[PDB]
């Protein structure tokens, strides 16, 4: 079942949810609070689970819930110095309170909504930080052939519908019909296909299906912007690449960059070692509907972006299979360390009953992985 991870059942039972989605006007200037403990780079449309214990941030969340349910997640370029040029607004869409261990705890789940630029960063006297936010817009470009088009051929630009057989031939027909007027320019049709939204989404869909057997077409957004953000949220890439993707404002350019990453970045090595290969892009399998990767929260509230892989090497096992707070139900986890540098890489999930498939796999933290081009 690929839908279980997205529900974050590990947090608890049904959580109070808010359907009041809110979006600020493009280019608008806002003032947004920043949660001090969050050190993750959030892509729009990406889910972020959180566990708050500190009284200050608990109070901040409580106040936010009553006003806009929105807070800023900063893409820290200099984490130690807390210098961030860009960030993402995150809207709280689920919230619950708990009194475990005789201590107040707040369990939350937010979703990234809009990228933005950082203008000012003011630290409040109560330990909370506020940011002057410039809501970035979505650079939307017209079809490449819109400018160079023939009035007679303006009709027949709407294809009947989308039914290799009946697909590759359909795509050949689509290229021939959509970029016919490419004969009026100095470039071929197949070159304009490399900048076409639909073709790029189709190629990315082929790759994702290669990563997921049960990936139905409807599961992905039909909008190029949302599709590009969804793809970016599930790529095993480092932080620098994630920031670079966030900077790109054009859906076409984002899709092209994502395709480049997926076609070139095939190895995943230890971040600290920089050379100890840990796995390859072929071993990635999607056990979550959101993608091969998903964010989870451990008991102490730390956020781990786990990527699931069939096989992993150069890993030493610490502890013994324990099912406590296991992110994937029915699987007992055991700590995995880099065989060379001993740095924690993830957890090996082993089956508890022999009827489960797969019988074993690994979940590697994204922050501990470096994508490498062989």
């Amino acid at each position: 079942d690929t839908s279980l991870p997205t529900s974050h059942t590990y947090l608890g039972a049904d959580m109070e949810e808010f359907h009041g989605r809110t979006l600020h006007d493009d280019d608008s200037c806002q003032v947004i609070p920043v949660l001090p403990q969050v050190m993750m780079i959030l892509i729009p449309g990406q889910t972020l689970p959180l566990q708050l214990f500190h009284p200050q941030e608990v109070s901040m969340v409580r106040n936010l819930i009553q006003k806009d349910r929105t807070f800023a997640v900063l893409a820290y370029s200099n984490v130690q110095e807390r210098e961030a040029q860009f960030g993402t607004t995150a809207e709280i869409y689920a919230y619950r309170e708990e009194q475990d261990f005789g201590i107040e705890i707040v369990k939350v789940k937010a979703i990234g909504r809009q990228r933005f630029k950082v203008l000012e960063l003011r630290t409040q006297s109560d330990g909370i930080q506020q940011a002057k936010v410039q809501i970035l817009p979505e650079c939307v470009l017209p079809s490449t052939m819109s400018a160079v088009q023939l009035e007679s051929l303006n009709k027949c630009q709407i294809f009947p519908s989308k039914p290799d057989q009946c697909s590759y031939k359909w795509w050949q027909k689509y290229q021939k019909r959509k970029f016919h007027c490419a004969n009026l320019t100095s470039w071929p049709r197949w070159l304009y296909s490399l900048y076409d939204a639909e073709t790029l989404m189709d190629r990315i869909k082929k790759q994702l299906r290669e990563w997921d057997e049960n990936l139905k077409d409807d599961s992905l957004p039909s909008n190029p912007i949302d599709f590009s953000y969804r793809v970016a949220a599930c790529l095993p890439i480092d932080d620098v690449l994630r920031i670079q993707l966030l900077k790109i404002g054009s859906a076409i350019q984002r899709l092209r960059c994502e395709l480049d990453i997926m076609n070139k970045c095939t190895s995943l090595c230890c971040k600290q070692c920089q050379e100890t290969e840990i796995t390859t892009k072929n071993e990635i399998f999607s056990l979550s509907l959101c993608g091969p990767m998903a964010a989870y929260v451990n008991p102490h509230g730390y956020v781990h972006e786990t990527l699931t892989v069939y096989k992993a090497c150069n890993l030493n096992l610490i502890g013994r299979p324990s099912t406590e707070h296991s992110w994937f139900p029915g699987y007992a986890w055991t700590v995995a360390q880099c065989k060379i540098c001993a740095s924690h890489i993830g957890w090996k999930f082993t089956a508890t009953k022999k009827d489960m498939s797969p019988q074993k796999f690994w979940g590697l933290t994204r922050s501990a992985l470096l994508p490498t081009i062989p």
């Binding site: 403990q37 214990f53 261990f101 102490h300 610490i318 986890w333």
Partner: protein, 35 residues
Amino acid sequence: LLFCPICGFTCRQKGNLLRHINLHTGEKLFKYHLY
């Protein structure tokens, strides 16, 4: 079985507990995480 609060690393002694925790890359925001 001192449990590391980040990854779940387990050990019975103490020194290796720090030897693991300080090996983690980040600020670790302990005041915001430890129960």
